[PDB]
Amino acid sequence: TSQVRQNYHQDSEAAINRQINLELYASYVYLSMSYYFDRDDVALKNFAKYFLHQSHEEREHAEKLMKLQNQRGGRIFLQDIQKPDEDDWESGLNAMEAALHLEKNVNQSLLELHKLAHDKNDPHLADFIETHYLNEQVKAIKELGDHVTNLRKMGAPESGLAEYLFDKHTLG
Amino acid sequence: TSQVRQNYHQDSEAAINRQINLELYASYVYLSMSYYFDRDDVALKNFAKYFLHQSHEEREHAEKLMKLQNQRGGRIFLQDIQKPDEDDWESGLNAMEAALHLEKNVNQSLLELHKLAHDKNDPHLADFIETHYLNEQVKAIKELGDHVTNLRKMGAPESGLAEYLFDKHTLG
Amino acid sequence: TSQVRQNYHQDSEAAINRQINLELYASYVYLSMSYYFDRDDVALKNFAKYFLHQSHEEREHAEKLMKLQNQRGGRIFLQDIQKPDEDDWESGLNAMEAALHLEKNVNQSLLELHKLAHDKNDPHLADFIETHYLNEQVKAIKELGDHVTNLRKMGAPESGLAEYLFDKHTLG
Amino acid sequence: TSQVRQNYHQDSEAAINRQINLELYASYVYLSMSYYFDRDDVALKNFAKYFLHQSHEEREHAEKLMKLQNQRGGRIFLQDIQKPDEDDWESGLNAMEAALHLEKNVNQSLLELHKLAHDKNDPHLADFIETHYLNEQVKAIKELGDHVTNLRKMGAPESGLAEYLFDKHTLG
Amino acid sequence: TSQVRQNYHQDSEAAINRQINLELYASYVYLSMSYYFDRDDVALKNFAKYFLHQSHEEREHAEKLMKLQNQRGGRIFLQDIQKPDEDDWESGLNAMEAALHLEKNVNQSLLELHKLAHDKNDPHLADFIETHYLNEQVKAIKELGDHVTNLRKMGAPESGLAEYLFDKHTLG
Amino acid sequence: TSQVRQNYHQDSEAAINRQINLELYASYVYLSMSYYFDRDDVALKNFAKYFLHQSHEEREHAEKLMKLQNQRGGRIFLQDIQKPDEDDWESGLNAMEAALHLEKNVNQSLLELHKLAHDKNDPHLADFIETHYLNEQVKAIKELGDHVTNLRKMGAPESGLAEYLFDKHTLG
Numbered sequence A, B, C, D, E, F: 001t002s003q004v005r006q007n008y009h010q011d012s013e014a015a016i017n018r019q020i021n022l023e024l025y026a027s028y029v030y031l032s033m034s035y036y037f038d039r040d041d042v043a044l045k046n047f048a049k050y051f052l053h054q055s056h057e058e059r060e061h062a063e064k065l066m067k068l069q070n071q072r073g074g075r076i077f078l079q080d081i082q083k084p085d086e087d088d089w090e091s092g093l094n095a096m097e098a099a100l101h102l103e104k105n106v107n108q109s110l111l112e113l114h115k116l117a118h119d120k121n122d123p124h125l126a127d128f129i130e131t132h133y134l135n136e137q138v139k140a141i142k143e144l145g146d147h148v149t150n151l152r153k154m155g156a157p158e159s160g161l162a163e164y165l166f167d168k169h170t171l172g
């Protein structure tokens, strides 16, 4: 037992390890997306920049959980980072839809983590999730839904003009 | 009778109370409009900002009338602020049309207030309305008509692209 | 169903709509109070300023709930804003007592909202209320009780001198 | 009953009074430790500074609880501050171990306070503890465990060189 | 025997330990007073600030004696800090009277310490008390007597107006 | 075939995809190492910082290869990022040895990539590897060997003092 460990259930410890993996997986998905937009035959630089920024943020989300595991006296066990479900993301609209889906899945995992923490009477962990993760997810999900809406309204993905103008005016 | 009251008819006093209500109602309408554009399934941030600014201006219009009522030694009697006629404003074009209609209704009420003031030989009140309210209404009505015109010309509301580009280039 | 909606109960959605109304009603009460102090026969400018500031803060409280409703994928339904229970607020002391009562009523509604959120396992909403609303209410209620105490100690409302000096030294 | 009191159980009130005492006791322990390091026959100035800073922080922790008691309309009842369990703290390593133990005891008391608050449906108090106290304790406990680890690794307390170099390089 | 000890009687050493306790007790009394004025039903913020500042100064007085004990090669033995004689301090005037009494008691203890030092031919200690403590006590006692006088002259404690105006004009 | 593709062999394309994976794997190894040093029972903050910086650099190495794949008109195919060979890195010295081994393995892969490029008469790719990768690897390998040497000379890993002082004086 770690000398710092206090009120920290082993189940919380394991669930943190799984969340770390999931944030690193979200990072990788966004990385993939980013360089899809950099292809010469896609060529939407601001979509690329947008997803690259996202990739870096997800890495940060993972690192703060790793710091938390050590803070609480848990032990980090890393697992493979799975490659994303696609190589080719099809269009700006499709990538934004896939990111929306992803952020809702990350959010469901976090809500389950909070439920676990409250079930184990770990208010430090429950508040950590509340403070640093839950509203961030809500904002990410809203922003992505806003982006989906606009791209749809504009005529994406059929309108190549729609995606070009969105890239310039919303993401740029 | 207030020690400051001078040349101020009771009918003017009551009509000021009604105008206060109407400016607060205009504020609420615009508030409603603003948060319609903030919905994830509408997502036109500059329409939202535009109407939010309008909401705040209308509050100012109401407060200056409330200050005037006290200046003249009248007494403020507030009434309920009615909720707007719609919950869902349909499109940018439709909201701009509804705001145009609203500002013409606020303007008709103000022109009736000025007529009343002149009928009661209250040049202070007539000039207050002239100076602070009438040209403001004329400008608001012109700007809204300009916005309606452009949105129509661009193909709104059917063109989701039209509303997006207007949001970016005119309201943004 | 909104594409962003996640873990958000319909009962939470409706209770947010009711809280929005209540914050707008608190705004209106304070507005009324403010212009009571601006009357020539009351003439306590810093009480007026104090309540006017309060009115504006309450509007902000309402707008942030409206933003939250859209963030979570709920739908805003606005209701009439009821006029306040009084036209004439009697004295500085009486208005401060009435504001105290009001803020405790706003606080009870918020504590009921938090209970609902926790009952629906919505930690995002529970934390939103905690973070942005609960301590604000506690502070407002303390400050108002401090003001009541002092005004009472000084001899308000009978001492017209008491209210004048409080206006100058505490509110000014 | 205080005019500001709302949703505040008497049991919460008493537990806050006990926590105030405990934070003042933690302050005194650290004060004792600090001046142990200032002895001519111990002479580790940065250990002294470290614990003195800690003493001052604990006083702050206590004052913010006293402010909270008054905010909620509870009443402060102070109790004697017990002298610490030792006069002579033996070594840098031993003092750091004793501080670790102390901070885990302060943390257990705070987790019990949070449990009580949640049991009484006092989300204001539960969040106050979360926001201002729980992560602070987690960080303090981590830092102290880090210090214990290093001092042990370096050969403290037998190595007088170890404590000297830690004082200079980690605490200085 | 400490390697630094020189011309330092054991009786001086013990009396320093008792003075340390007394300065920490004075700190606690003032702390209690301060948060009495922060109550919602007392609400005199500048009395609160005044006593809080005093509390912090007394802590400083104690720390400098603890530094002196180590400087001379004496050994610090801390004792419990007794809780103050009251929980409720009644009024501004009463608290100022109680502080006056307290500072005269701290001063009598210091004059006895100086007598002891001179009896033991310890001019370093006698001068330390002279330089750092005696005039400070004289000033504190004068200031407190000045405050008592004014509050009495103004009609405290019956005049709630008197205490309010003193708080604003003398302590604020 | 990409419209930009010129003088770019399919074998080069695949080898770039494998190098991307390897740089992401190097990133993950260093990430693991970093948070090993952050454990309360290891507690070497500058080792942690050193490896964290390394992790971020490796991510950069991978991103520049991904940019290169798109520049040349190749297609990115991402693979899982394998978890590192250890969870527990044992000591500063052991982690530095493991990083040395890793950087020599990354370097062997890069030298094989350069051989392939020259065999396919792709001077753009050969020079890209030369310019951006080969000397970087040489420097990394030298620095790591320098660190191993010093830690060994100092008595690591048995001397807990050795690792502490290296952390402070070389990595800090």
Ligand SMILES: [Zn+2]
Binding pocket: A054, A057, A058, A103, A140
């Ligand atoms: Zn994200």
Ligand SMILES: [Zn+2]
Binding pocket: A023, A026, A057, A058, A061, A062, A106
């Ligand atoms: Zn994330």
Ligand SMILES: [Zn+2]
Binding pocket: A082, A083, F080
């Ligand atoms: Zn796989």
Ligand SMILES: [Zn+2]
Binding pocket: A101
């Ligand atoms: Zn799905």
Ligand SMILES: [Zn+2]
Binding pocket: A026, A058, A103, A106, A140
């Ligand atoms: Zn995310």
Ligand SMILES: [Zn+2]
Binding pocket: A127, A130, C127, C130, D127, D130
């Ligand atoms: Zn919380």
Ligand SMILES: [Zn+2]
Binding pocket: B054, B057, B058, B103, B140
């Ligand atoms: Zn307008």
Ligand SMILES: [Zn+2]
Binding pocket: B023, B026, B057, B058, B061, B062, B106
């Ligand atoms: Zn208007």
Ligand SMILES: [Zn+2]
Binding pocket: B082, B083, C080
């Ligand atoms: Zn109605």
Ligand SMILES: [Zn+2]
Binding pocket: B101
């Ligand atoms: Zn009409």
Ligand SMILES: [Zn+2]
Binding pocket: B026, B058, B103, B106, B140
């Ligand atoms: Zn208008």
Ligand SMILES: [Zn+2]
Binding pocket: C054, C057, C058, C103, C140
């Ligand atoms: Zn308020």
Ligand SMILES: [Zn+2]
Binding pocket: C023, C026, C057, C058, C061, C062, C106
């Ligand atoms: Zn409010």
Ligand SMILES: [Zn+2]
Binding pocket: B080, C082, C083
């Ligand atoms: Zn009504």
Ligand SMILES: [Zn+2]
Binding pocket: C101
């Ligand atoms: Zn009531």
Ligand SMILES: [Zn+2]
Binding pocket: C026, C058, C103, C106, C140
């Ligand atoms: Zn309020």
